[PDB]
């Protein structure tokens, strides 16, 4: 059974791991290859800070909440193990800030110690009058990919640099199953106008005294500050439809000004890095089987917008179940 | 008017600075010490604001300190001071009453069952948001501020108060930490020896303090700016200045048990120091040439320094009123 995973970002690699894990014993052989034209550190996943928090707008979709829940419990079970530094996985607490009161989120019990902010905490943020405090976790995108890559390498998964032009190209080389985890660029392989880039820009600064995340909300251009292992991510940029890869100077100014107003100690933080990425925005994730005419199936797993880390593991297990249902059939 | 402060730890320097700011409106101030940063006990402290669990005016000096620091935590100077917000955990075997300082800190609450599931050894505790004021940095900062203001510093081991009086000191501010007894007998002053190590573990974003009602030989993990402090050693009466293998093993085993991610972390260093333990901070006046005592702040020198600095400044003001 020759499987080809197209995509080496969090979705591609986690899906690959779940397939190997569930079906390596069952197939003789399970042969798994990953193709991609961008590998860490050049993927969209590498840009992500990796804070576990779904978006504010609840889609009222319990399958998706359950994928998110699953990912969180999965991560939590790793967080106090020897592995965890290697995943780039740790616990972090912090603030969500609003101008107006709004209802409690549906994930309020998934995270730890969720509560409303007190008056004296709100006094620390003069521009905001309502908010949340909780403890969640960060899974730093670059590190996780590195960790996933090692696990895949130990298991005999091979990696190839390739820009795939079509599914047929891969099918004609003998792939029995193609796993399509091509993120925001999925449209090049099969027309899909619901998939758009949600362009983002961030900067990484040296500010190791910042121990909390801070997220603000006005639709998604509002500053956030999210400490990682080594650096602090500053951002708050979201431009639907914009395909520019360049760091933009207005946006730079917008992140820096906005974040400094929020946390003036940042004024003296040294800027280490700056990056631009494209969130794979789709009103919902594409995750399904689709047969081609060649015998060759595709499993789509793409379109996770601004929450790919938050939800990836549930999606990976689902994709593996689809893979399993292909085995039952064929 | 001539003042000599003895001691260059947090207590001496903060007292010096707080007196100068409030009274220079014509002070000659000198600091004498035989140890300056990074070699004082203050340099060993992680700098977490938390008073002891045991429960007079000291609670206000602590609260004054927190409020003072909280109001500068976004200042331009905060990075130089070594000052930042930090949240974390206090872990206990059984229920205990909320501390007197619970509304001083930010967002005090009990731990929820799911939080407690992360720590198999403990069934109860707290979460709250406090602050860190890193001793190394804070001392560098105060030294710099004091130096702008004319305060002159001298490497000197003072042999007595009279020695200093005879050099024309009008007021001696005695901020000699655990060694105050070598200048005036004090049977109530003992060393509370502590040992720590510092590791490179910058994914640790929370403090974790445990309690065993031992006394205070219980593991604690306290992230700093650059490094993370591992500790949990309190030995009353022990005067050994050196690090010790038994204690290193207690710190390391106890903390890795508490946080197994620490197995990965590189040890940067390892220090020993002496908390100035006393039933009570000695903060008061005596005549020999006038002396103001400010010593015996145990394991809460950083936590309490500013209120003590203010009280010593009031004491300094009353001496002026009398001259
Ligand atoms: C600034 C910013 C911050 C973010 N922060 C967070 C966060 O805190 N938490 C969170 O959950 N999410 C966050 N995200 C979202 C997260 O980045 C994405 O949802 C996630 O990375 C999507 O992963 P993916 O594997 O689908 O895509 P990618 O990581 O982009 O991987 C796509 C892969 O497909 C390959 N590929 C594509 N087309 C082809 C082809 N034709 N041939 C071969 N290879 C191909 C690419 O080379 C790449 O390997 C953030 C995004 C941005 C932009
Ligand atoms: C391991 C450890 C961890 C700690 N963690 C914390 C914490 O997180 N938070 C907290 O609030 N507290 C903490 N403490 C306690 C805190 O460090 C002390 O309360 C504080 O440092 C006392 O400061 P000091 O200036 O009184 O003494 P020191 O810092 O010891 O300074 C004493 C000064 O007196 C000088 N001196 C003494 N005698 C003479 C003489 N005859 N002539 C000249 N100079 C003299 C010395 O050179 C020195 O400069 C900790 C202590 C230890 C040991
Ligand atoms: O509804 C929201 C909106 C944001 C947000 C706000 C401003 C700018 C961009 C995203 C948002 C940001 C974060 C921080 C991490 C993050 C940041 C991103 O830019 C992103 O696309 N995903 N995740 C979050 O965990 C939840 C979020 O939920
Ligand atoms: O009653 C206590 C006891 C401790 C404690 C625990 C173990 C070893 C030493 C002190 C303790 C420790 C800390 C952590 C910071 C600290 C750590 C010390 O070793 C110390 O001596 N003072 N302060 C605290 O904020 C409050 C504390 O209150
Ligand atoms: K427990």
Residue numbers in the entry:
A (entry chain A): 1 to 218, 223 to 298, 302 to 337
B (entry chain B): 1 to 25, 29 to 58, 62 to 219, 222 to 296, 303 to 337
Task: Quote the study on this structure.
DAAO (D-amino acid oxidase) is a flavoprotein with exquisite stereospecificity for catalysing the oxidation and, hence, degradation of D-amino acids. Using FAD as cofactor, DAAO binds to D-amino acids and, via a hydride transfer mechanism, oxidizes the amino acid and, in the process, reduces the FAD cofactor. The DAAO active-site lid (amino acids 216–228) had previously been hypothesized to open up to allow for substrate access.
As hDAAO is a brain target relevant for schizophrenia, and because carboxylic acids generally restrict compounds from entering the brain, we sought to replace the compound 2 carboxylic acid with a bioisostere which could maintain the interaction with Arg283. After synthesizing and testing several analogues of compound 2, we discovered compound 3, in which the carboxylic acid moiety of compound 2 was replaced with a hydroxyl–pyridazinone group (structures in Table 1). The binding mode of compound 3 to the hDAAO:FAD holoenzyme was determined by X-ray crystallography. In this case, a higher resolution crystal form (P212121) was identified through sparse matrix screening and the structure resolved to 2.4 Å. The hydroxyl–pyridazinone substituent was stabilized in the hDAAO pocket by a total of five hydrogen bonds, two with Arg283, one with the Tyr228 hydroxyl, one with the Tyr55 hydroxyl, and one with the backbone carbonyl of Gly313. Indeed, compound 3, unlike compound 2, displayed the two modes of interaction with hDAAO discussed above: a hydrogen bond with Gly313 of hDAAO and a π–π stacking interaction with FAD. In the compound 3–hDAAO structure, amino acids 219–222 were not included in the refined structure because of a lack of defined electron density. However, we defined the compound 3–hDAAO structure as active-site lid open based upon two points of evidence: (1) The phenyl group of compound 3 overlaid with the phenyl group of compound 2 and would have sterically clashed with a closed active-site lid. As compound 3 is a slightly larger molecule than compound 2, to accommodate this ligand, compound 3 had a ‘tilt’ through the subpocket of the active site.
